[PDB]
């Protein structure tokens, strides 16, 4: 599977108000027609929705999926809401294939100057699967589009760009 990282990133809605592509949970759910889930405690964790939307808008459908976009130009396209299930799907040879596995002490130098998709598995104090996001490697720091969780047990990196 071939993906342009700049296209994927341009299509990603961030949960970080500091980020140029910020979109609140309220606005994200409105865009895709999930207004009725806003503040439903099963839908607090948006990381896998946000990564699903980035792929769909870049012309890559998420199959299988737990849910579907209910409104707009991408109505009917698949959204995976569960971070563990999305990370599993991304691992398939038809999506991104085998990621580079890292530890907190190695993920920053492991990613390096590369850009791609990142999964932070088993975060201390959080019982969810963890966090999936887009990351840009730089000289100063790794920058995730929404949040980085180097407090995690393992970190999976799928490189898509080297620059």
């Amino acid at each position: 599977m071939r993906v342009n990282f700049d296209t994927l990133y341009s299509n990603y809605p961030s949960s970080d108000p500091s980020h140029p592509n910020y979109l609140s949970q309220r606005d994200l759910f409105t865009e895709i027609g999930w207004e009725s889930f806003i503040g439903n405690p099963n839908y607090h964790n948006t990381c896998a929705i946000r990564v699903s939307i980035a792929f769909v808008k870049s012309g890559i459908n998420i199959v299988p999926s737990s849910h579907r976009i209910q409104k707009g130009p991408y109505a009917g396209k698949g959204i995976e809401v569960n971070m563990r299930r999305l990370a599993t799907l991304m691992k398939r040879t038809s999506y991104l294939g085998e990621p580079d596995p890292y530890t907190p002490a190695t993920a920053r130098n492991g990613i390096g100057a590369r850009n791609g998709v990142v999964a932070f598995n088993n975060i201390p104090g959080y019982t969810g699967g963890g966090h999936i996001d887009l990351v840009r490697g730089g000289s100063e720091a790794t920058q995730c589009a929404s949040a980085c969780y180097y407090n995690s047990e393992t970190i999976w990196f799928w490189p898509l760009q080297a620059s």
């Binding site: 108000p17 948006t46 969810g128 100063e140 929404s146």
Partner: protein, 101 residues
């Protein structure tokens, strides 16, 4: 009014969340990372202290999701409340977005 004792006002927290509260840092992307680290950690302090009582979901909501709900609350509320101590505003935001029952 200007009789303040608090380390962060609502306005300062909101500026940190937006990536604009580290004038001691040279690189603009490092400035953003430091600003957001401060807002996340301030929010975490209030969240951890109040998890039992004022809000519910502590083991099952990703920390950065709290920041998203706090930011929308800080923007929805009347602008003059931003001069209040940030911590009471965070507790209010958490109660509203993650109510106990």
């Amino acid at each position: 009014p200007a009789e303040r004792t608090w380390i962060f006002s609502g306005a300062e927290l909101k500026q940190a969340i937006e990536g604009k509260l580290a004038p001691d840092v040279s690189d603009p992307e490092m400035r953003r990372l430091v600003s957001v680290a401060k807002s996340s950690a301030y929010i975490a302090g209030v969240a951890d202290l109040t998890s039992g009582s004022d809000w519910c979901g502590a083991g099952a909501v990703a920390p950065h999701e709290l920041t998203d709900r706090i930011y929308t609350y800080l923007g929805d509320m009347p602008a003059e409340k931003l001069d209040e101590q940030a911590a009471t505003l965070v507790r209010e935001a958490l109660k509203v977005s993650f109510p106990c029952e």
